[PDB]
Design a protein around this nucleic acid. Structure first.
Length: 77
RNA sequence: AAUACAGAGAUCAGCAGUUCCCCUGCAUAAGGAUGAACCGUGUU
């Protein structure tokens, strides 16, 4: 299935975003749009994968994402 | 008129062309017959 559909239904799951600058964002997905802009709650962002700021909500532009690790649960969920 | 002469003086065959008439083609005119499952006012 399409990446976007996959995302739209991962709403409420936990996922890990790598940004183009190296920052890693662990959080629970709360919203997606057609340009893959995200909003996540219960957030922890890291300066790099080596690792630590906790944030309540984060908005991420989709053009800035290298990849998004999904929970293995994904296919059945 | 007398004479000199020279003195009795081609055939077999083919094709097209006019004239009507039939067969078969193509053209030009008019005429008809029948067949063809589909419907134009924010990433390069």
């Amino acid at each position: 299935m399409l990446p976007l559909y996959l995302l739209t239904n991962a709403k409420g799951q936990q996922m890990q975003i790598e940004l183009k600058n190296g920052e890693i964002i662990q959080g629970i997905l709360t919203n997606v749009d057609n340009w893959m802009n995200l909003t996540l709650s219960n957030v922890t962002e890291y300066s790099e994968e080596s690792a630590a700021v906790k944030l309540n909500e984060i908005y991420i532009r989709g053009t800035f994402i290298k990849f998004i690790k999904l929970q293995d649960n994904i296919i059945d969920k």
